[PDB]
Design a protein around this nucleic acid. Structure first.
Ligand SMILES: [K+]
Ligand SMILES: [K+]
Ligand SMILES: [Mg+2]
Ligand SMILES: [Mg+2]
Ligand SMILES: [Mg+2]
Ligand SMILES: [Mg+2]
Ligand SMILES: [Mg+2]
Ligand SMILES: [Mg+2]
Ligand SMILES: [Mg+2]
Ligand SMILES: [Mg+2]
Ligand SMILES: [Mg+2]
Ligand SMILES: [Mg+2]
Ligand SMILES: [Mg+2]
Ligand SMILES: [Mg+2]
Ligand SMILES: [Mg+2]
Ligand SMILES: [Mg+2]
Ligand SMILES: [Mg+2]
Ligand SMILES: [Mg+2]
Ligand SMILES: [Mg+2]
Ligand SMILES: [Mg+2]
Ligand SMILES: [Mg+2]
Ligand SMILES: [Mg+2]
Ligand SMILES: [Mg+2]
Ligand SMILES: [Mg+2]
Ligand SMILES: [Mg+2]
Lengths: 108, 95, 76, 353, 46, 37, 47
RNA sequence: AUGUAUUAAGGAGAGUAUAACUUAAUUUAUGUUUAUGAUAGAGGUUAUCAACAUAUGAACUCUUAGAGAAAUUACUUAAUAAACGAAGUGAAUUGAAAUAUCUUAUUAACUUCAGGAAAAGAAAUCAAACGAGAUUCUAUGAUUAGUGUGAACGAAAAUAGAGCAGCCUAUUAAAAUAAGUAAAAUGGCUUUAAAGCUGUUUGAAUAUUGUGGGGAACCUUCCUCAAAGGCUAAAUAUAAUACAUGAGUUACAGAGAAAAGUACCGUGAGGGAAAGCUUUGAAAUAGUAGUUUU
C-alpha cells in the first residue's frame, strides 16, 4: 500500500516562535518547539506516502512465469484436468440448498 | 489581573452603570425624573379556574394499563382534518 | 437575587462557567402564617432518619479525609 | 413556501449536529468513569489471586506453624476480611459493556429477545460449583446476571459500615450472583423411544412466533431448542400486583368523555396557542396566508428590480429583442420522409456503391 | 523587568477595550473574532 | 423426492414440569451425567 | 416526573386540536354541506 | 495517508430523566417484516425485551432590528463562519559565495466582489505548404528553443490520459456583427525584439471579386483566422460527513487534542498543556539481610 505518513518539523502544529532567548538563560539555545530534539517534535526522516513499486521487464516476468510452471511440472505438482473443473457436490444437497430447506448453518 | 477577570461580567461584580436585567419583561416606561410608570396593559395575569368539585388528579391508577390510539389505514390518524370535521357534524353541528 | 459560585463544567475539568442565579421573594401577608416546628430526631423514623444519619456521617468523614489530604497531610 | 422550508430543514440539521457532538463527548466521560469503577473489582480479584499464591506456599513450608489468617486484620488495599468478597463482586453490580451483555445471553437469544425467565431450573457450568442445579429467583437484565438461592452458592461478604450498627458483625454470608453465560436450562423432555421423562440440559434457545402489539407496546413469543425444534413452555410467572391509590383518578372520571369539536370558535382561547408553541421560532412550519403572501412579494420585488432597466432600452435594442420572440416561435424546420430518402441515397452511394 | 500594570485596573475598560461589541462593530475586530472562531476558542472576547 | 440427508423435523411442544404426572420420574439434583441437547 | 408527563400530554392534545381545527375550517370552506356564512344553521345533513 | 460516495453557512450561552436534549428538554401516528427475522409468556419506571421505512408535536437566549459593556434592554413570525475562486495592490528573508539588474516572486499578505464551486471557453488559435480544430486538470515534450554578464529563469507545437458539447431559436431569454476601436509615438508592465496590458498625445479600413488581424525585428507574397457583442454542463479547488484499504500509529507514538483549543500564561492580539487500561515491572535511587573486608 505504501501510505504510512509522519510529520516533519515543517508540518507539526504550533507557532514557529523562538522558545528561549538566544542567551542569558544558562540553558541550551532553542529555536522552534517543532524541532526533533523537542518532546512532540517532528521525525526528520520519517515515512512518507510514496510508491514502493519496482519495474521488471515483460520478458523476464514471462520467463519467471514459465519457470514456476516448469518447477511444478518437473516435480509432478502440476495436474491438468478437463474443462468444467468444479467440486462434484452431491445432487441431494444441491437440490436442498437451492430449495431453501437447508439453513445457512447446516448448508455451511 | 488573573483568572477571575476572564469570567463573564455580572451585575454583582461591578457598579457605575452596569445594568443587566433578567428577562422579566417591560411593565411600563421610564420618566425623565428617574421614576417608572407601570403600564397595566403589559402586566400579565394568571388565569386559574375554580378547582372546587374537580375529580381529576395528575395520576391515573396503574390498574388501567396505558394504551395508544389506533387509526388503521390512516397515515395522519390523530391529525386528520376530515376526521375532525366528520366527528363535528355528528356530535356538534350548531357550533 | 442569589448568585451561584463559578464552577468548572465537569467539577474538576472543563471550562469555567456560572449557573443561573436564584431569585427569592418575600411577600408581606395580610393574614399571618406560622410554620410547624421540625420533628425531633426521634420522630423522623418515617423518613428512615437512622439509615440517613449513618450515610451522612460516612459522607462527612469522606469529605474531611479529603480535606486533610488536600492540605498535603495524612492521618497518623 | 419553498424558501421557508429550507429555513427549517437547515435549522433542524444544526441542532442535530450540536446534540451529537455533546452526546459523543458525554458517552466517553461516562465510559471512562464506569471502566474506572469496574477496575476496582478487577484489582480486588487480582489481589486475591496473588494472595492465594503466597498463602499456599506459606502453608507448605511452615506446617505446624501455619498462621491463623482468619483472625487477622482487614486488608486496607480493599477493606475486606479474610475469605470475604466485596458486595460489588459478590452481587456483580458492575455495569458491563453492551458488547458483553450480548455475549452473556448468546446461548439464550438476544438481550432484547430473552428466552430465560425467573422460575426456570438451571445448571452451573463454570466455577467451583459446577453441575449445581438450582431455581432462578430473580433476573437482572442490566448486567445479565442471575440469582440462584442455593446454600452452596453463599459466600462471605464484607458489609460496609454506613449500613451496619456497632453491635452487628462485619461479615455475613449472601447468595452470589452469576452471569447468564455460566448457566444452562434444565428441562424434562419425554424420551420418544422409551416413553419416560428425564431431565436434560438445553445448550441453546431461540425465540419463535414473535408478535408485537403496537397499541399496548407489548410482546409475546415462544422459545424452542434449535436442531430438535422442541418448543419449551415458559415458567409460571406471577404478574405484578397493580393497585388503585387514593391520589389516583377514579376510573369513571378517566373514561368520561367531555370533548365536543367546534368549527366557528377555536377549541381553546386563541391566546393559548402562543403558550403551546413559540410564535417567532425558526422552526415554525404553519404560517398565516398574509405572512406567506408577504414573503412571495419580496421575491417579486427583487425580480422587478432586475427587470427595471427595460425602460432604458434604445429603439434598436427593443427591435432585436422582439425579433428573437418571433424567431424562437418559428421553430426548427423538419426533414420530410421524402427528403430523408434522398439523403439515404447519397449515404449508401458514397458508402457501399 | 515586569511591572504591576494591572494595579487599579477597572472592568469597565476591559469591556470597552476587549469586549464583544468592540470587535463585531469594527473591520479589524471581525477578523479577530473570525480567527478565534476558526481556532475553536470559547472565549472570543474579554 | 426423498433425500439421503436427515433434516430437523417440524416443531413439537414439550410438556411443562407442572403437568408431568409420570410416577417414576424424579428431578435431578446435580448436572452430572445428564444429556445435553 | 409523572406530573410532568401529564402536563406534556395536555400541551400535545391542545396543540393537536388547534391544528386539526385550523385545517377543518379550510376543508369546510369547500364542503357543499356546510355554509360558514350563516352561523345560526351552517350544517344541513346531505340527502 | 490515499481513494470512493454524498453534501454546500458555522459557533456559543444557559437549562434539562447524566445513553436519551431544549422549559413538551424520553411527543404522537402509519406500513411491512418479525428467528425460515434482521444484519401463544413476564415487563409502562421493576419502564423504554423491535428493527426497518414513511410522517408528526415541541425546539429557549446570543452572534443576528435599534441601542448597548454579546447572551441585556427593547421589540419582533428581524436571521449565512472558515477554507477554496476572480480581480486590484504587492514585499522581504534568500541565491548570486559582497552587491544595485536579476533572483526570491505575477510568491506571502491585504482589500473588493462572488458561488457551491468559481474562473475559462467554442479561434481576429496554432501550424507550415501536410494539416490540426473551444475551455479546464495531470504527465511527457523540457536541467529544450530561448533569455540573462552571471546566478538562474523558462515556453509552444505535438503526444498520452481525465472529461468531452456545442451554440445565437444561446433551453432563458443577449448582436441590427461592433471607432476614439485597431494602430502609432512616448512613459511603464509583460516579454525573446513579436503578440498581449496600459497613462499621455494622436488616430484606420470594409470580406477570398483578397477588406482587416496573425504567422517572434521589419517588408512582401501566400496561408490562416475574422477583434472592438454574448451563452454554455463535465473533468478542477476547498470544507464537512460516511465508507473502504494499510510490511500506517498503539499513549513522550498517532493530532496540539483517546474528556482540548479545555486547563493554564498573557492587558490584548496571541501562546498553549498534562492526562489511556485490570496486564508486565528494567535501570537509577533508598533502608535492610547473608558472605566477606575494613
Ligand atoms: K518569525
Ligand atoms: K506585426
Ligand atoms: Mg508527534
Ligand atoms: Mg461585589
Ligand atoms: Mg466591587
Ligand atoms: Mg449609564
Ligand atoms: Mg403479555
Ligand atoms: Mg413551550
Ligand atoms: Mg414544529
Ligand atoms: Mg518595560
Ligand atoms: Mg491606573
Ligand atoms: Mg444588533
Ligand atoms: Mg436582539
Ligand atoms: Mg558575487
Ligand atoms: Mg540555452
Ligand atoms: Mg467583427
Ligand atoms: Mg492597443
Ligand atoms: Mg507589441
Ligand atoms: Mg493586434
Ligand atoms: Mg516570420
Ligand atoms: Mg466573434
Ligand atoms: Mg500525545
Ligand atoms: Mg506501551
Ligand atoms: Mg515510547
Ligand atoms: Mg525496579
Amino acid at each position: 500500500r505504501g501510505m504510512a505518513s509522519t510529520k516533519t518539523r515543517y508540518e507539526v502544529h504550533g507557532s514557529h516562535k523562538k522558545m528561549s532567548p538566544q542567551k542569558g538563560t544558562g540553558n541550551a539555545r532553542r529555536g522552534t518547539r517543532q524541532s526533533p530534539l523537542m518532546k512532540g517534535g517532528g521525525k526528520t526522516f520519517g515515512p512518507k506516502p510514496r510508491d514502493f513499486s519496482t519495474k521488471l521487464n515483460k520478458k523476464v516476468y514471462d520467463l519467471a512465469w514459465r519457470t514456476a510452471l516448469s518447477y511444478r511440472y518437473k516435480r509432478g505438482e502440476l495436474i491438468v484436468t478437463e474443462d468444467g473443473l468444479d467440486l462434484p457436490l452431491p445432487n441431494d444437497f444441491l437440490w436442498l440448498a437451492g430449495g431453501g430447506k437447508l439453513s445457512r448453518e447446516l448448508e455451511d | 489581573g488573573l483568572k477571575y477577570r476572564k469570567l463573564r461580567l455580572t451585575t454583582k461584580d461591578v457598579n457605575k452603570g452596569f445594568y443587566k436585567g433578567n428577562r422579566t419583561g417591560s411593565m411600563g416606561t421610564h420618566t425623565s425624573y428617574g421614576t417608572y410608570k407601570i403600564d397595566y396593559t403589559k402586566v400579565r395575569t394568571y388565569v386559574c379556574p375554580d378547582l372546587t368539585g374537580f375529580k381529576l388528579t395528575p395520576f391515573v391508577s396503574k390498574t388501567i394499563r396505558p394504551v395508544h390510539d389506533q387509526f388503521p389505514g390512516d397515515k395522519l390518524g390523530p391529525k386528520n382534518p376530515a376526521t375532525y370535521l366528520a366527528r363535528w357534524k355528528s356530535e356538534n353541528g350548531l357550533d | 437575587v442569589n448568585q451561584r459560585m463559578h464552577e468548572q463544567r465537569h467539577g474538576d475539568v472543563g471550562n469555567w462557567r456560572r449557573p443561573k442565579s436564584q431569585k427569592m421573594m418575600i411577600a408581606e401577608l395580610a393574614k399571618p402564617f406560622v410554620w410547624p416546628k421540625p420533628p425531633a430526631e426521634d420522630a423522623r423514623e418515617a423518613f428512615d432518619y437512622a439509615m440517613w444519619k449513618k450515610q451522612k456521617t460516612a459522607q462527612e468523614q469522606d469529605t474531611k479525609f479529603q480535606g486533610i489530604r488536600a492540605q498535603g497531610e495524612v492521618v497518623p | 413556501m419553498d424558501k421557508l422550508l429550507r429555513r427549517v430543514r437547515m435549522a433542524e440539521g444544526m441542532v442535530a449536529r450540536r446534540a451529537q457532538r455533546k452526546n459523543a463527548l458525554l458517552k466517553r466521560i461516562t465510559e471512562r468513569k464506569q471502566n474506572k469503577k469496574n477496575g476496582e473489582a478487577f484489582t480486588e480479584a487480582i489481589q486475591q489471586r496473588k494472595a492465594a499464591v503466597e498463602a499456599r506456599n506459606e502453608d507448605w513450608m511452615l506446617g505446624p506453624l501455619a498462621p491463623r489468617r482468619e483472625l487477622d486484620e482487614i486488608t486496607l488495599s480493599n477493606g475486606n476480611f479474610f475469605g470475604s468478597l466485596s458486595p460489588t463482586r459478590a452481587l456483580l453490580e458492575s455495569e458491563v459493556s453492551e458488547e458483553e451483555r450480548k455475549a452473556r445471553v448468546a446461548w439464550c437469544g438476544s438481550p432484547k429477545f430473552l428466552c430465560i425467565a425467573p422460575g426456570d431450573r438451571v445448571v452451573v457450568i463454570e466455577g467451583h460449583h459446577k453441575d449445581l442445579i438450582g431455581t432462578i429467583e430473580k433476573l437482572n437484565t442490566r448486567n445479565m446476571t442471575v440469582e440462584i438461592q442455593s446454600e452452596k452458592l453463599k459466600t462471605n461478604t464484607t458489609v460496609p459500615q454506613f449500613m451496619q450498627n456497632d453491635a452487628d458483625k462485619p461479615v455475613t454470608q449472601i447468595y452470589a450472583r452469576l452471569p447468564i453465560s455460566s448457566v444452562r436450562l434444565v428441562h424434562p423432555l419425554k424420551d420418544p423411544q422409551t416413553g419416560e421423562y428425564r431431565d436434560v440440559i438445553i445448550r441453546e434457545l431461540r425465540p419463535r412466533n414473535i408478535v408485537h402489539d403496537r397499541p399496548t407496546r407489548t410482546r409475546s413469543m415462544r422459545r424452542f431448542v434449535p436442531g430438535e425444534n422442541i418448543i419449551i413452555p415458559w415458567p409460571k410467572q406471577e404478574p405484578i400486583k397493580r393497585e388503585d391509590q387514593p391520589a389516583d383518578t377514579l376510573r369513571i372520571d378517566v373514561d368520561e368523555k367531555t370533548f365536543v369539536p367546534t368549527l366557528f370558535r377555536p377549541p381553546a382561547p386563541q391566546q393559548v396557542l402562543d403558550e403551546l408553541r413559540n410564535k417567532y421560532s425558526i422552526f415554525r412550519t404553519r404560517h398565516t396566508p398574509e405572512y406567506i403572501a408577504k414573503k412571495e412579494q419580496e421575491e417579486q420585488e427583487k425580480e422587478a428590480k432586475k427587470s427595471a432597466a427595460k425602460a432604458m432600452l434604445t429603439p434598436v435594442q427593443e427591435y432585436n429583442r422582439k425579433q428573437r420572440e418571433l424567431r424562437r416561435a418559428r421553430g426548427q424546420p423538419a426533414l420530410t420522409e421524402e427528403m430523408l430518402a434522398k439523403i439515404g441515397e447519397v449515404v449508401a452511394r458514397n458508402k457501399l456503391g | 523587568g515586569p511591572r504591576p500594570t494591572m494595579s487599579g485596573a477597572t472592568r469597565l475598560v476591559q469591556k470597552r477595550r476587549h469586549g464583544f461589541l468592540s470587535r463585531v462593530k469594527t473591520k479589524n475586530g471581525q477578523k479577530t473574532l473570525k480567527r478565534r472562531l476558526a481556532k475553536g476558542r470559547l472565549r472570543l472576547s474579554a | 423426492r426423498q433425500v439421503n440427508l436427515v433434516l430437523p423435523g417440524q416443531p413439537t411442544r414439550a410438556d411443562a414440569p407442572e403437568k408431568i404426572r409420570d410416577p417414576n420420574y424424579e428431578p435431578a439434583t446435580s448436572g452430572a451425567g445428564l444429556q445435553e441437547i | 416526573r409523572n406530573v410532568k408527563q401529564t402536563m406534556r400530554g395536555i400541551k400535545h392534545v391542545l396543540t393537536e386540536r388547534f391544528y386539526a381545527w385550523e385545517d377543518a375550517v379550510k376543508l369546510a370552506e369547500q364542503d357543499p354541506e356546510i355554509d360558514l356564512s350563516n352561523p345560526e344553521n351552517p350544517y344541513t345533513p346531505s340527502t
